[PDB]
Amino acid sequence: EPCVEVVPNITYQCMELNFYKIPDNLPFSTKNLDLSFNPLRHLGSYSFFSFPELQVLDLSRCEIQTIEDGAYQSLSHLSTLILTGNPIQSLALGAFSGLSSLQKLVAVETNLASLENFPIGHLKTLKELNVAHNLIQSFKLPEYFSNLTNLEHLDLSSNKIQSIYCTDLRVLHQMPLLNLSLDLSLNPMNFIQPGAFKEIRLKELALDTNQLKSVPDGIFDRLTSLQKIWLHTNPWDCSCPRIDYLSRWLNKNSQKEQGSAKCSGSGKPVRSIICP
Ligand SMILES: *[C@@H]1O[C@H](CO[C@H]2O[C@@H](C)[C@@H](O)[C@@H](O)[C@@H]2O)[C@@H](O[C@@H]2O[C@H](CO)[C@@H](O[C@@H]3O[C@H](CO)[C@@H](O)[C@H](O)[C@@H]3O)[C@H](O)[C@H]2NC(C)=O)[C@H](O)[C@H]1NC(C)=O
Ligand SMILES: *[C@@H]1O[C@H](CO[C@H]2O[C@@H](C)[C@@H](O)[C@@H](O)[C@@H]2O)[C@@H](O[C@@H]2O[C@H](CO)[C@@H](O)[C@H](O)[C@H]2NC(C)=O)[C@H](O)[C@H]1NC(C)=O
Ligand SMILES: *[C@@H]1O[C@H](CO)[C@@H](O[C@@H]2O[C@H](CO)[C@@H](O)[C@H](O)[C@H]2NC(C)=O)[C@H](O)[C@H]1NC(C)=O
């Protein structure tokens, strides 16, 4: 057997074994399958018919360019799907058909340019979507996000987002159950429009290591139950009264600040600024 048997009947590690096809020699009972670093290249319909009990499937760095309709149709119990580092160029509209239990979808560095085209609108069980390290230019969340009533973590870090506009979070405003962690850090973001966050419950908000010189007055005033926020490594303009709102807010909410937002040119912590 080429794969490593971690737990008999349950967990198999098939990493870097030059598989060009899904293995057919493993137990039907398998729950956890790691196929990372294999030249899989294309996933046809019913690729995982031998693995109906799968809960976790790792397809990281498998050179996958295309995923056909029903590629994972068999996988009614899959909770975690990992597609990190595949040069995906064709994702069929029914690519994720059958994934009735999916809670975590990891699509880091999958050549993703927009959420609009991304066929995940039927995955109502989804709790976490990780699309970090991609090519997304817009934070406008598509209408299908209203289907994702269990979403609690959205990672859009290391993308190509330059702005947050008011309309961007429109879909989320109608969703009271929401308790969302939102990572928008490591983006070339230099603009946040006034009123962009209106009373959403963002448990966590990361906007560090962007290109922000300022934020609108009152931008965070309507946030509900914010627990942690990252704002550091931005070129903050600490001239008064421009920095008045943000310095006041960070001072008051200092327990929530992770890391230290600092003034461009002086390095003084933004939370320590007091305008005359
Ligand atoms: C956002 O969701 C809606 C509906 O959500 C349902 O999704 C299913 C999979 C399941 O999770 C369930 O719990 C949700 O209520 C999507 O709109 C619906 O799309 C389906 C097609 O998959 C339509 O069903 C079809 O209906 C026609 C007749 O009307 C039949 O001939 C077909 O066989 C099939 O049953 C359904 O009508 C749509 N509902 C409405 C009111 O639009 C929507 O597509 C989705 N958004 C995205 C972009 O994914
Ligand atoms: C547990 O898995 C076995 C098959 O895997 C066995 O043999 C090795 C691969 C070994 O590493 C270890 O995983 C395990 O002992 C299942 O038995 C097989 O079931 C199929 C039908 O699905 C039969 O056709 C096979 O004859 C039979 N054994 C063989 C030789 O492969 C077994 O059903 C499964 N048990 C549970 C509780 O799910
Ligand atoms: C979002 O916040 C809500 C409100 O506190 C959390 O829901 C509660 O979670 C605790 C612990 O699991 C339970 O004791 C309460 O009964 C829950 N209340 C509800 C709404 O039924 C929720 O867990 C938070 N979400 C995240 C992702 O942390």
| C-alpha dihedral sign at 216, 221, 226, 227 | positive
Q: Measured in whole angstroms, how far is the alpha carbon of residue 19 from the centre of its chain?
A: 28
Residue 114, SS3 per DSSP: coil
Residue 105, SS3 per DSSP: strand
CA distance 95 to 42: 12
Q: Return the structure tokens found at 118.
A: 């991304």
b/e code 99-135 from CB counts within 10 Å (16+ = b): beebbbbbbbbbebeebeebbbbbbebbebbbbbbbe
Whether omega for the bond prior to residue 142 falls within 30 degrees of 0, making it cis, is: no
Strand partners, 42: 66
Determination technique for this entry: X-ray
Which ligand is closest in space to the CA of residue 181?
A: 3
Q: Ligand 2 pocket test: which of 28, 30, 31, 77 has the largest number of ligand atoms within 8 Å of its C-beta?
A: 28
What CATH number has the domain bearing residue 256?
A: 3.80.10.10
Amino acid 8 reads P
Q: Return the structure tokens found at 195.
A: 């009123």
CA distance 154 to 220: 19
Measured from the CB, is residue 152 less than 6 Å from ligand 3? yes
Which ligand is closest in space to the CA of residue 203?
A: 3
Residue 206 main-chain phi, psi, to 5 deg = -115, 120
Distances (CA, A) of 68 to 64, 71, 169, 245: 11, 5, 31, 50
b/e code 13-23 from CB counts within 10 Å (16+ = b): bbeeeebeebb
What is the stated resolution of the deposited model, in angstroms? 1.7
Q: Ligand 1 pocket test: which of 97, 116, 147 has the largest number of ligand atoms within 8 Å of its C-beta?
A: 147
How many domains does the chain divide into? 1
DSSP string across 192-237 = E-TTSS-S--EEEEE--SS--S---TTTTTT--S--EEE--SS-B-
Residue 262 main-chain phi, psi, to 5 deg = -125, 150
Q: Are 238 and 266 in contact (CB under 8 A)?
A: yes
**Is beta strand 42-43 parallel, antiparallel or unpaired with respect to 66-67?**
parallel
Measured from the CB, is residue 179 less than 6 Å from ligand 3? yes
Measured in angstroms, how far is the CA atom of residue 54 from the centroid of ligand 1? Answer: 26
